[PDB]
Structure formats: structure tokens, C-alpha cells
Amino acid sequence: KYVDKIHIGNYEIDAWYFSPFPEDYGKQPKLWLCEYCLKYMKYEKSYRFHLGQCQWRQPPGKEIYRKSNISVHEVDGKDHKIYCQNLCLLAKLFLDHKTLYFDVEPFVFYILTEVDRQGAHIVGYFSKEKESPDGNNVSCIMILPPYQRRGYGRFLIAFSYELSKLESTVGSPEKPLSDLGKLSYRSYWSSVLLENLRDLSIKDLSQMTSITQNDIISTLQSLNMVKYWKGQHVICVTPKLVEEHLKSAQYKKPPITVDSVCLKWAPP
Ligand SMILES: CCOc1cc(C)c(F)c(C(=O)NNS(=O)(=O)c2ccc3ccccc3c2)c1
Numbered sequence: 672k673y674v675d676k677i678h679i680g681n682y683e684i685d686a687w688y689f690s691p692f693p694e695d696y697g698k699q700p701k702l703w704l705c706e707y708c709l710k711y712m713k714y715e716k717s718y719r720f721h722l723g724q725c726q727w728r729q730p731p732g733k734e735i736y737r738k739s740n741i742s743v744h745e746v747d748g749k750d751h752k753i754y755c756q757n758l759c760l761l762a763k764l765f766l767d768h769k770t771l772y773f774d775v776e777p778f779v780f781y782i783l784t785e786v787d788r789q790g791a792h793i794v795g796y797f798s799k800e801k802e803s804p805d806g807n808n809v810s811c812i813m814i815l816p817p818y819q820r821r822g823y824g825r826f827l828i829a830f831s832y833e834l835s836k837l838e839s840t841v842g843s844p845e846k847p848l849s850d851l852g853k854l855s856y857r858s859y860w861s862s863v864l865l866e867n868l869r870d871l872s873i874k875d876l877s878q879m880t881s882i883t884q885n886d887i888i889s890t891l892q893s894l895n896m897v898k899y900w901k902g903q904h905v906i907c908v909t910p911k912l913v914e915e916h917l918k919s920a921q922y923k924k925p926p927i928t929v930d931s932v933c934l935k936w937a938p939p
């Protein structure tokens with residue numbers, strides 16, 4: 672018997688996938704998680720006692736982004752091992768393709784929280800290899816189900832590319848993506864490229880956005896905005912066609928924007 676339901680914060684959430692919590696935790700009807708320190712517990716009574724004792728009201732690590740009540744904490748897997756392992760166990764309940772939960776030292780974790788009077792409430796995260804040979808600027812990215820399709824995933828994707836810009840590099844998420852992640856990345860790439868084309872070579876868009884040339888090219892192909900000439904992809908778009916694409920409803924929702932001015936981060 673696996674964990675099939677969690678209580679975290681004020682949410683009850685059904686599991687989507689197997690996550691390797693210890694056997695005696697999976698057997699329980701529900702797993703109870705402290706939303707601040709991510710300790711998982713077997714019983715409502717141990718949960719209620721913990722909530723009166725726990726002094727955490729936000730993730731550990733350094734707050735590298737704060738604008739209004741939106742916050743991002745950077746958490747080193749080597750500095751906060753247990754927390755990052757519990758985060759990976761939580762994430763695995765909603766990610767099919769995540770395979771690493773306990774060897775968290777090679778990773779840095781970026782925790783998105785929404786803050787109110789009581790504390791900073793976890794929304795989602797992405798992990799990232801301290802050293803990525805493959806040029807991946809995201810390893811795994813997960814938004815908890817009650818926050819999905821509400822702009823938080825768009826914020827986290829945009830945030831991962833802001834880090835890449837500061838690192839003077841391009842990057843791409845590690846594959847395979849979840850289905851929602853796949854849809855979200857394609858819409859993000861489209862929105863960014865169309866906006867830049869409205870206001871360039873493929874190499875130019877790559878340096879401006881930190882999106883890889885491959886991801887630009889596949890996105891421009893899906894939009895039918897590229898020609899091919901003697902082995903080279905070439906941007907082929909009229910300023911009117913760009914506007915028409917931005918009209919589509921899928922870009923109508925107002926984003927939670929990443930304000931470069933509020934990002935407190937120096938590249939390693
Ligand atoms: C278990 C998987 O967890 C995830 C993972 C990722 C990467 C997600 F993005 C999400 C999510 O919740 N996506 N929906 S979104 O944030 O509203 C959104 C995202 C991109 C947009 C681009 C352009 C215009 C609007 C957009 C809205 C959930």
C-alpha cells in the first residue's frame with residue numbers, strides 16, 4: 672500500500688504516482704506534512720502537536736526573490752539534506768519521471784511560496800543541477816495540484832530562465848516533462864518569442880531569452896514562422912502575423928511577472 676492522500680497546510684491532495692516513503696508511512700490512510708519544514712507524519716494527532724511546536728514559517732535557505740507576497744527560497748541540497756529529501760518525496764507524488772529523492776547533494780532547490788500573515792506557504796519548486804553537463808537549467812519542476820494552471824508554473828519557468836540569463840548561458844528543462852509541463856513550456860516559449868518579435872536571428876533570440884536554439888526552432892516551427900534555406904532555419908514572420916498569434920486567449924491571463932529588480936542572486 673502506497674501513500675495515496677496527503678494533508679499539507681489547509682489542503683488535502685490525492686496522490687498521482689508512487690513515491691517511496693517508508694513502508695510504515697504508506698500503509699496509513701493519509702500522510703500529514705508540515706507545510707513549512709516538510710516533516711511527514713502518520714497521524715492527525717502527531718500533526719497537530721507538531722504544528723504547535725514547529726518554529727518554521729518559511730522554507731530554509733536564502734530568500735533570493737521577494738516581491739509583494741511572492742517569494743523564492745534557494746536551498747542547497749548539501750546544506751539542508753532532510754528538507755530537500757522530503758521535498759523530493761512530496762514532488763514524486765505528482766511527477767511520474769522523477770527518479771532521485773535521497774541523493775540531493777548535487778542539486779539546488781528553488782521553493783516558490785505565497786506569503787500571508789501566518790507564513791510563507793509552499794506552492795511548488797524546481798530543482799537544478801549545480802553542474803549540468805547537458806545544459807539543463809531545470810531538473811524537475813512541480814506545482815502542487817491546487818495551484819496548477821493559476822500562473823505559478825509560468826512564474827517558475829520564467830524564473831529559471833532569469834537565472835540562466837544571469838549565468839550568461841542558455842538552458843532547457845530536463846526531459847521528459849510532465850504533460851502539464853510540456854504544455855506550459857511550449858506556451859512560455861511561444862509567449863516570449865512572440866513578444867520579442869513584436870517589439871532578430873534565432874541566435875539573437877537565444878541570447879536575449881536564454882532559450883536554446885533548438886527550443887526556439889521547434890517553437891517557431893509549431894507557429895509556422897520559420898523558413899529553411901540550404902540547411903539553416905530562418906525566421907520568417909510579418910509583424911502582423913505576430914500580433915494575430917498574441918491575440919489567442921492562451922496569452923490573455925495576466926502573469927505573475929519576475930521583476931529582475933527583486934532577484935537577489937549572483938551566479939556561482
Ligand atoms: C506536476 C507538474 O507541475 C507543473 C509544472 C509546470 C512546469 C507548470 F507550468 C505547471 C502549471 O501549473 N502550469 N500552468 S500555468 O502556471 O498557469 C502557465 C504556465 C505557462 C504559461 C505560458 C504562457 C501563458 C500562460 C502560462 C500559464 C505545473
Ligand code: NA
Pocket residue numbers: 683684685816
Ligand atoms: Na486532489
Ligand SMILES: [Zn+2]
Pocket residue numbers: 705706707708709710721725726727
Ligand atoms: Zn514543521
